[PDB]
Design a protein around this ligand. Structure first.
Ligand code: CA
Ligand code: CA
Ligand code: CA
Lengths: 82, 48
């Protein structure tokens, strides 16, 4: 993950953030983008969480570090649009 | 002369370096830098 050269060479996602802990930034360095910085790094150890689409009734998903947000449309709500 | 040696009488007079007694200072000549390189040559790289 870290070394004298692991973080001195070119930043590639096919290198640093994959086979250790991927603590931080090494998922942001590759892209230079703090938008999905903490909406994807939660999916390094335990697997994805929105791939099941818990929200039904045409509701979008949002991943948080422990709980899932389900955006349901006007007049629709719920923990999973439930 | 005493500036030469001879084994016969353990004959050699001790001395000292000239520049040690009084040093000199001219810096040096270093306009061209000096570089080390990776054993291969290009080190870093990137799939293509
Ligand atoms: Ca690596
Ligand atoms: Ca990176
Ligand atoms: Ca990295």
């Amino acid at each position: 993950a870290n070394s004298f050269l692991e973080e001195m060479k070119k930043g590639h996602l096919e290198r640093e953030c994959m086979e250790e802990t991927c603590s931080y930034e090494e998922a942001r360095e590759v892209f230079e983008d703090s938008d999905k910085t903490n909406e994807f790094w939660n999916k390094y150890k335990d697997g994805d969480q929105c791939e099941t689409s818990p929200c039904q009734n045409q509701g979008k998903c949002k991943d948080g570090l422990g709980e899932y947000t389900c955006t349901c449309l006007e007049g629709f709500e719920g923990k999973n649009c439930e | 002369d005493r500036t030469r040696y001879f084994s016969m009488w353990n004959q050699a007079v001790d001395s000292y370096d000239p520049d040690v007694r009084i040093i000199e200072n001219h810096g040096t000549e270093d306009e061209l830098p000096n570089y080390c390189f990776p054993l291969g040559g290009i080190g870093i790289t990137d799939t293509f």
